Write a protein that holds these residues in place. Structure first.
Motif, mmCIF file in Angstrom:
data_model
loop_
_atom_site.group_PDB
_atom_site.id
_atom_site.type_symbol
_atom_site.label_atom_id
_atom_site.label_comp_id
_atom_site.label_asym_id
_atom_site.label_seq_id
_atom_site.Cartn_x
_atom_site.Cartn_y
_atom_site.Cartn_z
ATOM 1 N N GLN A 110 6.690 -31.805 -25.644
ATOM 2 C CA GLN A 110 5.788 -31.775 -24.486
ATOM 3 C C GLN A 110 4.649 -32.737 -24.841
ATOM 4 N N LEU A 111 4.419 -33.662 -23.918
ATOM 5 C CA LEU A 111 3.346 -34.649 -24.068
ATOM 6 C C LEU A 111 3.650 -35.635 -25.203
ATOM 7 N N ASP A 112 4.925 -35.935 -25.395
ATOM 8 C CA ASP A 112 5.303 -36.906 -26.445
ATOM 9 C C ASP A 112 4.826 -38.315 -26.084
ATOM 10 N N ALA A 113 5.145 -38.731 -24.849
ATOM 11 C CA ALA A 113 4.819 -40.150 -24.481
ATOM 12 C C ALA A 113 3.335 -40.442 -24.607
ATOM 13 N N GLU A 114 2.544 -39.510 -24.110
ATOM 14 C CA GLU A 114 1.101 -39.531 -24.002
ATOM 15 C C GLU A 114 0.355 -39.514 -25.318
ATOM 16 N N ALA A 115 0.883 -38.825 -26.317
ATOM 17 C CA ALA A 115 0.210 -38.728 -27.631
ATOM 18 C C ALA A 115 0.869 -39.486 -28.764
ATOM 19 N N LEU A 150 2.181 -24.607 -19.120
ATOM 20 C CA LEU A 150 1.107 -24.091 -18.239
ATOM 21 C C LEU A 150 0.574 -22.783 -18.831
ATOM 22 N N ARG A 151 1.517 -21.989 -19.310
ATOM 23 C CA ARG A 151 1.241 -20.652 -19.863
ATOM 24 C C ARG A 151 0.322 -20.779 -21.078
ATOM 25 N N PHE A 152 0.698 -21.660 -21.943
ATOM 26 C CA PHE A 152 -0.060 -22.039 -23.145
ATOM 27 C C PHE A 152 -1.529 -22.325 -22.859
ATOM 28 N N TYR A 153 -1.793 -23.249 -21.945
ATOM 29 C CA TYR A 153 -3.129 -23.667 -21.528
ATOM 30 C C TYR A 153 -3.859 -22.580 -20.755
ATOM 31 N N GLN A 154 -3.117 -21.878 -19.936
ATOM 32 C CA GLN A 154 -3.663 -20.749 -19.185
ATOM 33 C C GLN A 154 -4.196 -19.690 -20.137
ATOM 34 N N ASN A 155 -3.493 -19.376 -21.221
ATOM 35 C CA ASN A 155 -3.910 -18.393 -22.181
ATOM 36 C C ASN A 155 -4.848 -18.901 -23.270
ATOM 37 N N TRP A 156 -5.010 -20.168 -23.413
ATOM 38 C CA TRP A 156 -5.809 -20.774 -24.459
ATOM 39 C C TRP A 156 -7.246 -20.256 -24.499
ATOM 40 N N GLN A 157 -7.676 -19.975 -25.719
ATOM 41 C CA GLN A 157 -8.972 -19.433 -26.093
ATOM 42 C C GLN A 157 -9.781 -20.427 -26.916
ATOM 43 N N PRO A 158 -10.872 -20.894 -26.287
ATOM 44 C CA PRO A 158 -11.763 -21.890 -26.907
ATOM 45 C C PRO A 158 -12.442 -21.311 -28.141
ATOM 46 N N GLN A 159 -12.619 -22.147 -29.137
ATOM 47 C CA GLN A 159 -13.332 -21.802 -30.376
ATOM 48 C C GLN A 159 -14.818 -22.067 -30.188
ATOM 49 N N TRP A 160 -15.158 -23.206 -29.577
ATOM 50 C CA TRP A 160 -16.555 -23.622 -29.353
ATOM 51 C C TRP A 160 -16.743 -23.978 -27.884
ATOM 52 N N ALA A 161 -17.995 -24.146 -27.503
ATOM 53 C CA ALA A 161 -18.346 -24.596 -26.142
ATOM 54 C C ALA A 161 -17.962 -26.097 -26.057
ATOM 55 N N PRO A 162 -17.678 -26.521 -24.838
ATOM 56 C CA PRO A 162 -17.294 -27.914 -24.581
ATOM 57 C C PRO A 162 -18.360 -28.805 -25.159
ATOM 58 N N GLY A 163 -17.918 -29.863 -25.816
ATOM 59 C CA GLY A 163 -18.814 -30.850 -26.410
ATOM 60 C C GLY A 163 -19.440 -30.485 -27.741
ATOM 61 N N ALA A 164 -19.250 -29.264 -28.182
ATOM 62 C CA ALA A 164 -19.846 -28.760 -29.426
ATOM 63 C C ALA A 164 -19.314 -29.500 -30.597
ATOM 64 N N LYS A 165 -18.030 -29.597 -30.792
ATOM 65 C CA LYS A 165 -17.357 -30.213 -31.917
ATOM 66 C C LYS A 165 -16.087 -30.969 -31.462
ATOM 67 N N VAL A 173 6.787 -23.704 -27.251
ATOM 68 C CA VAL A 173 6.401 -24.329 -25.999
ATOM 69 C C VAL A 173 7.155 -25.633 -25.870
ATOM 70 N N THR A 174 8.261 -25.569 -25.126
ATOM 71 C CA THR A 174 9.190 -26.717 -25.041
ATOM 72 C C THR A 174 9.605 -27.050 -23.627
ATOM 73 N N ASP A 175 8.862 -26.580 -22.666
ATOM 74 C CA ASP A 175 9.211 -26.894 -21.244
ATOM 75 C C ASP A 175 7.901 -26.741 -20.480
ATOM 76 N N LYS A 176 7.827 -27.262 -19.282
ATOM 77 C CA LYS A 176 6.609 -27.323 -18.510
ATOM 78 C C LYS A 176 6.052 -26.010 -18.070
ATOM 79 N N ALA A 177 6.828 -24.997 -17.899
ATOM 80 C CA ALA A 177 6.391 -23.651 -17.503
ATOM 81 C C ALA A 177 5.685 -23.033 -18.715
ATOM 82 N N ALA A 178 6.289 -23.292 -19.855
ATOM 83 C CA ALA A 178 5.664 -22.731 -21.122
ATOM 84 C C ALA A 178 4.322 -23.416 -21.331
#
Length: 361
Positions: free
Chosen positions: A215-220, A132-147, A125-130
């Motif tokens: 991706q997200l270098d400046a931010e993190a 979006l795809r990454f996050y779009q396909n992402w599968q949560p492990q826990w419910a929000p706020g759980a851990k 994942v090295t470009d902005k299209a990738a």
């Protein structure tokens, strides 16, 4: 008896000298804030090859300390009424569909409790299209706020979404809204050609390395700064009252509020805090990769608890070539900035900081 520069010099020297040696750090820069007054110290060399020593002007890669800049910029935006922590992610990236995203807010991304975003964005994942795809396909492990799972992909995303309303880039927003106002003229996301002569080389297995694009270098993790700028940054956060821009002062305060309790540690926006006085062992052993990278239960503090002066505020950060550590106790008006051009164990950083500061309290 207020310690004198030379007494502060012996404590510092006595601690760092040995450290640099055992860990084999090419060069270091440390600032002590003692009763609100900065004391700088520099050791070693910035470029072993070109034989350039560490200076008060030498730029170091802050790695994850960059997250503190993120948190504050997010804070300022909140203060301006541009974003709300409670707002849905979806509001800010409508191109981002998938019901797994329906109940996730800004808060969850900022605070690493969205449900398991991974530590790093994947290697493919090295470009902005990738992206979006990454996050779009992402599968949560826990419910929000759980851990809480510490992740670049979480806070990284928070940063990017948070500057959206303004219509500015993150780099533009950051410069305009935070760096300019606090006069951090030696603090960069992109280091100019003109300042390359002050940019230290990071050392990895004796080889000179600089952080690479991502991706997200400046931010993190992509801020670069000097001992002097890190010190103004610590002072400003230590006491927000000195800051003239109302929104920034407010963002600093919000960034230090307490949103989640993760066993004796509290999560703000980039900053992590512990009540003062604190037990050395808690901070040292909580800094170990065994604890700091684990998924831990998180109890929510809602409404958030306000920033208290009686706290131990700190952040560790590393890059392939650099190791940084910053800590402060607002109530005692004391802090430390430790910048190294070699990434060494977290617990050794935290432990050396404590040694120095215990002697000054």
């Amino acid at each position: 008896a207020a310690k004198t520069e030379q007494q502060i010099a012996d404590i510092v020297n006595r601690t760092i000298t040995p450290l640099m040696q055992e860990q084999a750090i090419p060069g270091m820069a440390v600032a002590i804030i003692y009763q609100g007054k900065p004391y700088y110290f520099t050791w070693g060399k910035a470029d072993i090859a070109n034989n350039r020593p560490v200076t008060q002007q030498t730029l170091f890669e802050l790695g994850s300390v960059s997250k503190t800049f993120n948190g504050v910029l997010g804070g300022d935006a909140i203060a301006r009424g541009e974003i709300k922590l409670s707002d849905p992610v979806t509001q800010y990236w409508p191109e981002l569909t998938g019901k797994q995203w329906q109940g996730i807010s800004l808060l969850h991304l900022a605070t690493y409790t969205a449900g398991g975003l991974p530590l790093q964005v994947p290697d493919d994942v090295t470009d902005k299209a990738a992206l979006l795809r990454f996050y779009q396909n992402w599968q949560p492990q826990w419910a929000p706020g759980a851990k809480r799972l510490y992740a670049n992909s979480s806070i990284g995303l928070f940063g990017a979404l948070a500057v959206k309303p303004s219509g500015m880039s993150y780099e533009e927003a950051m410069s305009k809204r935070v760096l300019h106002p606090l006069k951090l003229a030696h603090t960069w996301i992109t280091v100019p050609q003109s300042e390359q002569k002050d940019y230290a080389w990071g050392y990895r297995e004796g080889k000179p390395v600089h952080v690479s694009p991502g991706q997200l270098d400046a931010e993190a993790y992509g801020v670069k700064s000097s001992v002097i700028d890190m010190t103004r940054w610590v002072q400003a956060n230590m006491d927000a009252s000195q800051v003239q821009e109302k929104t920034l002062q407010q963002g600093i305060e919000l960034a230090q509020s307490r949103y989640w309790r993760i066993g004796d540690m509290y999560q703000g926006l980039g900053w992590e805090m512990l009540n003062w006085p604190v037990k050395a062992d808690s901070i040292i052993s909580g800094s170990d990769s065994k604890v700091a990278l684990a998924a831990l239960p998180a109890v929510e503090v809602n409404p958030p608890a306000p920033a208290v002066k009686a706290s131990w505020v700190h952040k560790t950060g590393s890059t392939g070539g650099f190791g940084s550590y910053v800590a402060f106790v607002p109530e005692k008006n004391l802090g430390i900035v430790m910048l190294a051009n070699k990434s060494y164990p977290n617990p050794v950083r935290v432990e050396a900081a404590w040694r120095i500061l215990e002697k000054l309290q």
